[model samples]
Each structure stands twice: as C-alpha cells, then as structure tokens.
Target: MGCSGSKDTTNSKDGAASKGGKDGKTTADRKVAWERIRCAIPRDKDAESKSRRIELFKQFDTNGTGKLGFREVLDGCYGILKLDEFTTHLPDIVQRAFDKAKDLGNKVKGVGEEDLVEFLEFRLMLCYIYDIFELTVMFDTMDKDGSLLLELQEFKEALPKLKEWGVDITDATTVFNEIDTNGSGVVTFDEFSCWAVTKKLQVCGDPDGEENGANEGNLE
Candidate 1:
C-alpha cells in the first residue's frame, strides 16, 4: 500500500464512527471515546515493564495470529479492560473492542470496516490504555485482605476461581517462585503481571474447548 493510501479511512465519510446507534452514538464512537479516557490510568511499573507489554499482547493473540480479530479482542478485553466501563462505554461492546488496538498500525490492521488489529499497533494506542492498570485490578483480587500483595496462600486459594475464568496457573508455587522476584514472600501487582507475562501460561477463555478422541478404541 502506498504511503498516501495508508491512512485508515474506514471510519471516515459515514462509517462505523459516523452513524450512531438508536441512542445516537455508534459503537465506534463510544469505543474511541472510551479508549481516550481509559488511557490516562496508570499501571505499576515493574522491572520488566517493556518485555511484559510485548508478551501481554502476545498472550491475547491466542491462535498466534500475530494479528487479532473479534474473538481475540473479546478474550483479551475480558482480562485487559477495567471493570464496568469496559462493558459500559462500548455498549455494542465486544465487536468494537479493538478499534484502539488497530488505530495505530503501519497499514490498516483494521482488516475491513471493523477488522482486527496487530499487537504493537494497539499497545501504543492504549499503553496507558487501562490494560496495565487492568493488571492492578487482577492483582488486588488475588491480594485478598488488602495488604496490596499476593502471598502464596492467597494465590493458591484464588486458583480454582481463576481457573473458572481460564487463567491457568496450574502449579501455583512454581508460578509464584518465578514471580516473587524480591524474595519478599509476596508479589506486588507490578511484579506478578510483569513476570507472569514471561511465563507464557495458558489462558484459555473458551470453556467449550476442542474435543478429540485420539484413543477412542485404544482401551485394549
């Protein structure tokens, strides 16, 4: 694509961004508005911040598409967006979640009028995009009694609940040891999220997982 032809005009001249819903605000409009507002929130800066962000997005491109579409955005948004408003501001919600993620690509990561986006493209658009801050929320949930830290016991207790949500931390101690960088017997939100990014733990949101019977008749 030529440089002049590279700009994303999908939302231009009466596109998703132009028309409103029945309430006179399109999903595109609300999504853009929300992205700007949420980007102001801050995250705990950890030792591995840069590396963490890269892998954070990678974790979401579940099929390893390197580019994300409707499903990937919804999966990622489930973990990455802040509460309430993530569902609120973007009412049509799930479908429009990646507008910000794609808003910054080299070519149009937005494949169609409302297509998917690549990794780096969205990260920049929303680094302060509430995704990292979203991490703080996850940490606090694991933190429990409000010491602002995750102890081993607390982490273990939260596992089955987290498993319900598909955050697969199978061996809690093993995962904790990797994340408890300071040997403080606890992981701050910053440390857990930053370190967790590197582990590449399985994050399967689809409870309706694939089914196969490779050993269907191997019962002999």
Candidate 2:
C-alpha cells in the first residue's frame, strides 16, 4: 500500500476569507448563518408571530399562488432571511429542504400534490434548514467535486466522519443506496438530509438540544 503521500491538501488554496474552502462552507460558516437566520423565523406557537411569518411567506409567494416555487423559496432565503453568506450551497440546501417538506406533507395528507411549498411546508422547510446547517457543512466536505451530489466513493470515504457523528454506518454501500432513494446513481443533499436526520447524526454536541415536537420522524 502507498504511504507517506498524505493527499491531505488542507491548504489547497486561499483568498476567500469569509467563504469556506473550495466551494465548501465550514461548520463555523453554517453556525453563523444559522444564528443569523434562526431568529428571523417567527416562533411556531405565537399567534401574532404566526401571522408575521405568514405575511413574510405571502411576500415571498409574490404571485398569489398560495404556495412557493423554487425561485420564491431561494429568494426568501436570501432576501427575507437576510443571509449574506450561505450562497455556495444555498440552492441545493433549499432544494433539499423543499423536497423533504413536500414528501412529508404528501405522506401525512396521503396524496401527491403539486410541488409548490405551502405555509406549513414552508415552516417545515425552515425547520429542515435549521436542523441541517451543520450537517450540510459536513456533506459539502464529503462532496469533493463540489457537484452537490455524492457518489459511492465519496460516501465510503465519509464513513469515519459518519461514525464520528454517530451515524451507525457499518455498510457504506447499503446506506448510500438507501440515501439515493431515486436510484439516481448519485446522492443528492435532499436524500442525505432525510437519512441523516432520521439517524440523529450530530456534529457539535447537544443530542437533545431542541426538538420541534414533531415526532413523526427526523427529516433534516
């Protein structure tokens, strides 16, 4: 076996101070983004804040569609959330969140509706975003090519990190297949987030920090 080559390349390049390395956001970047945007989302229980959040959602809907398109959701993250950073992976992250919300909503309702995100789905999307911030950072690192998709090799490479995060992945290929639900031959962030949340993977402590009381399942 080859040894001493290291292949670490921890210093691949430099310059983007606020940005993370090579199209990947660091965990700190995610934390900052989370803190900045978390406060903006109205609390779920308060009636007044519920209206406020609904108002915000209506503003983003923009077309009176009673739901949000991909563009609308992306714009909400940037414009409404006031997020200056997180652009590197925002698109995929938003897609992941939206898909998870849509899937869960359909499951609960027992029908396949249109893909647009309603107010309840929007709230669930935000929950997904909040839960998956740090996990997204980790996913980005695993996505070596920055393609926002993961192949089996990358999934296999990520086993150590998975174990560190307490993911319980004994067979990388099997788990990778599970995550790639569509059999698309590649794993998207959406599928990964769904699986990760279900497994309760955590990176930065507090395994029981804040549960939203939605015990249905952990769809990050």
Candidate 3:
C-alpha cells in the first residue's frame, strides 16, 4: 500500500529496485529507494507543516531561550531502547519509546537540570517538517489529480494504505473534519501540516493545552 521499498542488492539503506529496459530486459537500479526518499523530502516549498512547527516551537520556548526541551524528551525515548536493542520490532519498540518519551520531566528527563540539552525552534521545526516531507510523499501519491490536496473521495481511497501504516482511521469523516482544519470538506497541504505537527507535539505534552492532552493522540 505504501511505497514498498526496493531491495535489488545495494547493501545500503535504499539499495532497494529494478527498471526494465526497452529491450525487455530488467536492470537493477539502486536509485529507487534513494529517489523515493529524495522525493519524499519537502525541504522546499512546504509551508503548512513549517508554520505549525513554528507555532509549536514558539509555544514551547517559554523562557525566550529559543530552545525547547525536545531533545530531552527524545533522549528519554532512546534511553530505554538502548536496552536489549531490539529497535526493529514494531509496536513494541514504538509503543515503548512513545511511553518513555512522554515520561519527560518525571522519568524520561527534564527541561531544567544540571546540563539538559535544548534545541532551537528551527531545529525542531526541521524535524517536524521533514516528517511532513515523508508524509507528503505518500499524500502526493494519493492526490492523483495533481490538486496538491485531498478530496474526501481520494482520502477515503487512501484508507487501506493509511491503515497499513497503522493509522486505523475507521471514521473517515471525523478524521477529515480534523485534517481539513477549516471545515472546508477538503484537505490541503497546509491543513495537513497543522494536523501533522499537532500530532508530533503529542510526543511530550498536549501542545493544544487540553485537559486530556497527555492521553491525546498522534494519528487519532
């Protein structure tokens, strides 16, 4: 459903497809994985996610220090994974990492300490933007009409693929309402960016300041 990675034999992360020659022959192309990743990156012209990330960044940089405790929380997630090192297991590692990362200020880490690490909003925005970049790859692929947006029908069509990635969005309309942000019944990159960055913020605390924020969701 998603971009199935290639593994033709490059012994690298993306050394993974083959392109067929016009002569009816197949040739290995190590470039497949790399190309997919390169295209997935929205380093240029991705405004929605960037704007939301900036909003979150400013929201969290309480001390006007230009740094958020993101790295601290991130380390909390990795701190546990460094144990047993079975980082490849899905759900297990992912769920655990998420749990630990959320434990920031209590068990994972804290914003103020002897020498806690801090990150600039720009750096934090980069992380979220790059994430949106990856998502844009999949989102764009689903936008068959080149509309740079998702119609309810198209997003509904992407359900299987979305579920494959563990999104499990059973209520398409509810999800769409949230993703569309402005209640326009259509999802654009900017709206998608707002949704994506908000999800990313759930890593530590509720960026939205809700009462149940800690128990809020990323994909939900």
Candidate 4:
C-alpha cells in the first residue's frame, strides 16, 4: 500500500505594502508628544489654551451678539491682557519706560502698536531677570527666617497677597514647582533662571522662528 506523502509548499509574498512596516510615529504617539509639549507650558499661558479659546471669542463679540467679527480679534487680545492682573501691568510699565526715555532726552509720547510690541519683547526679557531676583529674595527670606522648607500652609497664605497684585497664585505655584528643580522644597536663583529661560524659549519660539530678528526703531 502506498502511504500518503505530505507535500512541502514554499510560496513567499514580498511587496511595497510589507516593506519595513509604516515608519514615523503612530498618530496616538504624536498626539501624546504634542500634549506633553503643551503641558510643559506655564499654567497662566495654558489658561489661553483651547478651553479658554471660547472666552476670547466671547470677548470678540463685543456687542454680546454671540458672534465675532474681524475687529473682535484685536479686541480679544487686548481684553485678555486687561483681564489678567499681572499682564494688565504692562501698560503702566510701558508708560514708565516712556517717561524714562523722555528723561534721557529721548522724546517719546504715546505707545502705538509697534511700541507696544517692542515693550512686550522687553517685558519678556525683564521677566527672566525678575525670576532671578525673586529666587534671590526667596533664599534670603528663607535663610533669615531659618526655614529649610516652605509649608503648603505658608504658600496658601502668601498666594492671596500675590493675587492682589494680579498674579494667579494657582498658576504661580505650577511655575514655582518647575523652578524648584532639586525638590529641595525651595528654589535657588539658578533654578529660577532655568525655568525663566525655558518659558522664554517657549513663548518666543526658537531663535530661527518667525519674528526672531525684528528690530524696533525709535519713532521720533
């Protein structure tokens, strides 16, 4: 009797469809990376995120008509800054700068759009400097007070006072944590500088991004 013999089959299929699988990251992975980049921003700026995007739209609806016009976009940007206490200080700061310019025999009167833009850029730079100063003060305060760490209760009490100055204490705490790099319960000047530089970089974009090399000329 002849036994049934098994037959071996070797048929391979290789084409472009199976070439090295799809490269690049999956959509979900890309989304996650984008989310991380967004979350890394300070909370105050994050307030302007999509959730608050509608708030901007509402402001643009100056007539309370529930719709925005082209003019509303300009109003919205200005209104958001006016709504924020810290940011609202900008006008006064600019005015002070203008006064100084006059004092130095540099005639300056009103602040126009170009002036405002330059002022904003300068303010961002000042924030980085202030971050350093703040850390120095914090160290001196903690050292003189003989406190190795600041308690949440202390933070809570201090937050309200800062809020009076238009600072969002809730948002500030988030920034504070970022600057407290060593987890030593307090921030040093260097850590604050790092945080400031990171934030500045995020806002201004990379050195090569648009609006990088713009110059401001005196409008006498």
lDDT of each: 0.48, 0.63, 0.45, 0.39
Per-residue CA lDDT of model 3 for 77-169, tens digit only, reads 345323112211223322323332333333333444332323322333344434444455566556753345778676767766665643356
Q: Pick the candidate with the highest TM-score.
A: 2
What would the TM-scores of all predictions be? Answer: 0.34, 0.51, 0.37, 0.25
Worst 10 residues of 1 by lDDT: 200-209
Q: How far is 71's C-alpha from truth in model 4 (Å)? A: 42
Off by over 4 Å in 3: 1-117, 120-124, 166-170, 200-220
Clashes of each: 2, 0, 2, 0
Error of model 1, residue 167, in angstroms? 2.7
Q: Write the per-residue lDDT of candidate 4 for residues 1-220, one digit (tens) a residue.
A: 7878768744558432222355433334434543453343222323444344344334445566642322333334335534122221234333332333223221223443332223223333333333333333334343434232444444555455434433343576786776566776765434443444334334443223134365776788
Instruction: Kindly report which residue pairs in candidate 4 clash with one another.
Output: none
Clashing pairs for model 3 are 6-16, 7-16
lDDT of 2 at 189: 66
Ranking by TM-score: 2, 3, 1, 4
lDDT of 4 at 117: 21
Question: lDDT score, residue 78, model 2?
Answer: 68
